[PDB]
Structure formats: C-alpha cells, structure tokens
C-alpha cells in the first residue's frame, strides 16, 4: 500500500520523567532480560502480615521520650511532666556522641521514631497516645492528674478543672495510657525541630496545645521497706487518624556507619 499519513498531535519532549512524582510512568531502560521485568510482591517476609512499610503501622509504635521522678518530697499541685502536644521529640540519652580529637567530643541529638518518620514531610495531624509508666509497688500510693489543655499553656491562673482530665488513683495501678485528640484551629500543624523547654505560645505553629501530668498528692511510702522515689516513664504513640502531608521538608539526614 504505502499511502501518506495525517499529521499527529503536537507533542512536547522531556529529558526525563518527573523525579518528584510517585506514580504514572518511568522512561528508564530495563537492564533485565525483558522490559517491565518486576519481582512479585511477597508479604509477611517479616513473619507477620502487617505491612512493615506502611506509615499507619510505623506510626503506632511506642517509644520512650522522657523520664521524671515522683517522690515523698513532691508537693501537691506540682507539675511532674509538661509537654507541648506534638509527635516529634528527641531521644533522651541516645545521642550520637563521637570523639573528634584526643579531648574534643561533640554530641548530636537524635530524632524520635515519629520525628524521623515525619522528618521528610511538612505538616501533621491526628490524635496522639501518651503512655505513663510508674515503676513502683502496690505499696506506694499517689494521685496524678493528666489534663489536656488544647489551645493554651499551663501557667499562673491556669485552672486544670476546665479541661478533660483523668485523676488516676495509683495504689495497685501502675500504668496509664490516653489518646490525646487533635484539637487545633488548623487542620494541620507544623513539623519542626523539637523543643522541650518551650511553652505553647512559642511553637504555636507546630503544637496543638500542652498536656500536663500534675501531682495531686505527695508520694506515700514507708521508708523501711520501699523507696521514696518512683520514676515516671513517658512513651509516645501516634494514634490512628495520624495523617502527614506535604513532603517538601527535611529535618534529619541519615547516615550509615563504617565497620570497625
């Protein structure tokens, strides 16, 4: 035959498909035996059907973020623990501390599990789950008050009776874990460099509010059989609606180590 052909649609040509995009198509060459040679997805390699790669699995893993004490010298209404409500923290003592010279040592503060996982994004949302462990016996005793102040600080003139709180009687009880909801004027808050020693009024863009663990009582204990100190162990979990968007940031660069 061999007849002519009508003109086609005007095209526009690129050097590469868009690096930025997750989907659509890729122009690479296949160095395999055939094109679109792919390895089938095999699940439960880790022994469980939980997709260990899923964000909704990783985010739900508890992690210790700070320790406090609760003693027989604690006054009532004394704050034991006070944090901005935010997913990203620093690891307490798990710093990377390398020697530079015979006597110069430097310390890199290391990221929370949530801090690392949200490190590449820009905004977050959803409820968080704060767990409190009390390493004690059935023969210590104490009331703590976990009150969630959604928009404000805990300062002078801050009555905790306005806020969803839980007054837990720690006689036999030993642990405590609440889901702190996402209450904010913004559908998303900012991921940031974590700062323990900041109020909420600063970092107002990265936190929803402040949560406070407050003593209602001194720690009751007979000194001849049990101790006077009891360590508060705080963990952070990331709820179920915890959603994270806008992947145009980096707060933490990872590196690998060299074998020694």
């Amino acid at each position: 035959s061999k007849p002519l052909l009508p003109i086609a649609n005007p095209t526009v040509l690129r050097p590469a498909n868009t690096f930025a995009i997750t989907d659509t198509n890729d122009m690479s060459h296949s160095l395999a035996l055939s094109n679109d040679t792919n390895v089938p997805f095999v699940k439960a390699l880790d022994g469980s059907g939980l997709d260990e790669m899923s964000f909704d699995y990783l985010k739900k893993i508890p992690q210790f973020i700070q320790s406090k004490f609760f003693t027989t010298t604690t006054k009532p209404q004394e704050v034991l623990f006070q944090t901005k409500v935010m997913p990203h923290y620093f690891v307490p003592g798990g710093d990377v501390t390398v020697a530079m010279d015979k006597d110069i040592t430097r310390t890199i503060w290391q990221p929370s599990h949530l801090a690392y996982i949200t490190s590449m994004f820009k905004y977050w949302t959803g409820s968080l789950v704060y767990t409190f462990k009390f390493v004690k016996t059935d023969y210590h005793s104490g009331r703590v008050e976990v009150s969630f102040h959604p928009f404000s600080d805990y300062t002078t003139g801050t009555y905790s009776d306005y806020t969803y709180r839980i007054i837990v009687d720690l006689r036999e009880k030993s642990e405590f874990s609440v889901t702190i909801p996402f209450i904010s004027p913004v559908p998303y808050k900012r991921i940031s460099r974590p700062d323990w020693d900041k109020p909420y009024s600063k970092y107002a863009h990265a936190s929803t509010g402040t949560l406070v663990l407050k003593a209602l009582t001194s720690l009751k204990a007979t000194n001849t059989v049990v101790s006077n100190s009891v360590e508060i162990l705080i963990e952070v979990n990331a709820g179920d609606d915890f959603n994270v968007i806008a992947p145009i940031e980096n707060i933490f660069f990872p590196f690998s180590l060299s074998p020694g």
Partner: protein, 231 residues
C-alpha cells in the same frame, strides 16, 4: 526412550528394599530368617519403663531449655544490660538436649520462643526490657546502635516486664532470613540477637533473679545430612 530388548538379565526390581534412608539394590539372592511366628507381650507385662506418650524430634525442640539463671543488682542503670546477649539460635541449639537432636539434619526453619522468669517480693520496683535485633551478622553496622539505648530497642520487636507485676514474660520471634532456613552444619545466618536492657533501675538493695528459657515452635526440619565440614 532408547528401546532395549533384554532377555538374559532379569529386571530384578525386587531385591530392592529401602529401609527409611538407605536403599539396597541387590543381585543374586536376598535371605532373611529368625524365630518364626513372632508375638509380643501385652503392655501390662512391660511398659513400666515408658510414659504413655511418644516424643518425636520436633518436640525436644518444643521443650523449654534453660539458657540463663542469674541476677542483677541496683547498680546497673537504665540503658545497660541486665543479662547477656543471646544469639538466636546459636546460643540455644548449642545446649546438648537440642544439639543432639538437630544433628543429622541439614537446617532448621522455625519460630523461636524466648521466655524469661522474674523473682520479686512485693516490695521491689523497676521495669526491664527484652528485645531482639533481626539478623545481627548481616547488618553488624547497625547492631550496637539499636541495642545500646532503650527507645531504640523498644521500637523494634520487644517485650517489657514491670518487676512488681509480671512474673513471666515470653517474646515470640518468628524466623526471618534472606534464606529459607538456618544452616545447621555451618551455623550461618542467625535470625535475631536477643538483648536485655534496664528500663528503670531497682529502688531497693535486693537484687532480682531471672531465668531465661528458649524453645522453638513452627518447626520445619531440613534434609538428613552427615553435617561435618573440613578444617
């Protein structure tokens, strides 16, 4: 098939008797004799030497085996070990109960179960963490950074114990490897390194004692082998 017309040699397909593993294929004649009309004594007459049960080689692996039996005082703080590290399954199958049975097998694919006991009179406090780093010989770069600190172990697969609440604790570690099984003849590619840290120190002088048990479930034993390598 290349066709073969044989009339001088019998296709002696009998005189071929496999006995479990060994196959004899014989020419001339096979003979067998003994006392004829064999009976057996009923079980009341003997059987005072056995239990009313049978033990395979899969149990003997499902039996708990004591690995550790020790203590730890109040001098060890958070993020420090209270028990020695355990290689799975090297520090388990090296005990004679298991090793005598795994011998004659190529490999092992099973989930391992590490159970730990804890002794507490109700006046003692503290918490303790038991985690497992997968495949420590394949990623040695990352072992000691994921196990020198609590909150990098507990986001791994871990199990905690409140000293004044839990008297037993058992972590189930499923088999996981780039491979199908765990080479027994060369002991290559252990699938976890159990490490034990202190989540919070003791509050009294009285140390705490602990027993570490280890067994396997979901056991798939490999092919029979001699199991000896050159050196």
């Amino acid at each position: 098939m290349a066709e073969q017309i044989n009339e001088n040699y019998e296709n002696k397909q009998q005189l071929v008797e496999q006995t479990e593993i060994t196959t004899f294929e014989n020419d001339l004649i096979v003979l067998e004799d003994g006392p004829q009309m064999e009976e057996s004594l009923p079980f009341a007459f003997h059987g005072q030497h056995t239990d009313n049960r049978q033990h395979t080689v899969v149990n003997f692996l499902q039996r708990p085996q004591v690995i550790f039996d020790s203590s730890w005082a109040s001098d060890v703080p958070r993020n420090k070990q209270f028990m020695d590290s355990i290689m799975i399954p090297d520090d388990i199958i090296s005990f004679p109960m298991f090793a005598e049975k795994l011998k004659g097998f190529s490999s092992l694919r099973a989930t391992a179960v590490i159970t730990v006991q804890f002794q507490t009179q109700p006046f003692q406090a503290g918490r303790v963490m038991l985690g497992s780093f997968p495949l420590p010989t394949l990623n040695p770069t990352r072992v000691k950074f994921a196990t020198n600190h609590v909150s990098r172990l507990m986001l791994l697969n871990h199990v905690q114990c409140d000293i004044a609440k839990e008297t037993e604790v058992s972590l189930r570690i499923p088999f996981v490897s780039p491979y199908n099984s765990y080479d027994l003849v060369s002991k290559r590619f252990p699938w976890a390194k159990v490490v034990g840290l202190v989540y919070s120190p003791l509050t009294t002088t009285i140390p705490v004692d602990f027993i570490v048990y280890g067994h396997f479930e979901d056991v798939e034993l490999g092919c029979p082998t001699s199991g000896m390598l050159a050196q």
